Assembly symmetry: C3
Homo-oligomer: 138 residues x 3
């Protein structure tokens, strides 16, 4: 179902000029993360830039995590993806939420302030507990 996530706004544009992350529709899996830039950023082929989303989140439950993923169309069509490929957010992380924006493509691409550059999916996770064995059972 649903999960309450605390949000701290670090850039005053968020909620104003740049909407807070939101599900585009009722059936969307991911919330859109936007580039909180002071000017357009032209990201060169194979360049990585660390971009602020203008917020911090705190998931607050040990069996919840979030992953930052590329946008499907932008990642395919323009190669704007993530330098760390999938950004995993721990339930106890409280820092600024940053996107490692990597242009894997062969052409430069300009991201304007407020443009959607990734998405955030909140998901349930399990906590593994190991048992060391000599041979696996079952």
């Amino acid at each position: 179902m649903t999960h309450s996530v605390q949000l701290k706004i670090l850039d005053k544009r968020l909620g104003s000029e740049f909407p807070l992350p939101a599900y585009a529709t009722t059936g969307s899996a991911g919330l859109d993360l936007r580039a909180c830039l002071d000017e357009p950023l032209k990201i060169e082929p194979d360049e990585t830039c660390l971009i602020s989303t203008g917020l911090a989140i705190y998931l607050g439950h040990s069996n919840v995590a979030a992953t930052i993923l590329p946008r499907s169309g932008l990642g395919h069509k323009h190669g704007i993806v993530l330098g760390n490929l999938v950004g995993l957010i721990d339930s106890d992380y409280q820092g600024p939420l940053m996107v490692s924006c990597w242009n894997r493509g062969k052409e430069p691409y300009t991201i304007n302030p407020g443009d959607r550059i990734a998405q955030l999916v909140v998901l349930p996770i399990l906590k593994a507990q190991f048992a060391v064995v000599e041979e696996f059972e079952l």
Copy 2:
């Protein structure tokens, strides 16, 4: 447990010459997605090609999503991975299911029609509801 997913077949080879996506075993996490090509495709180093799977899916439940991921061995050994890195499918998406096939490797690779080029994992997701705070609690 299980989840019913509606499937629309867009290429008549699916279910015939090219098996529908299936779990290889009872313990497989992912269903294999195959390249619905009219001829072999030689994908050059660093090239991305959008490839049809010959179907459309509709997950139909707001707390279910699917991710398209590279094959482990093909992605490691040959660099055949995804141009958008992880393709997230929303519960309300109804369009053709396409794979952004990116050859990150240094050698060209030939994909034959019907070859497995990615896998699809169906998973539960949470719907985040934000609360804006000045300082995080707990």
Copy 3:
């Protein structure tokens, strides 16, 4: 909640010189996977190396999977990520757990034996059951 995972130690350094994978904190989503190398490995720009974690796991439940993901900071700052982008581990897989370490960066990077090179997230998955339809309902 939690999930028991059987672990087979293949390199005697594991648990000794190199800690077993563990959650760094109570709120960590991922367990750290370490490089079980016999000497430091200098991974060239765009090179992929298959690196042993010195173990094998067996998740053992059909609705559990695990994904190997890059480290967030190492993947962003140094481009040390995964050749297959996300390594999905099936519930019935029993083989050595290996990391496809890809340096997507422009500079070489040296990984020392025992260094953390990826993380492993254990998560619930659904088993899809298709129904072929001519038109989607609902």
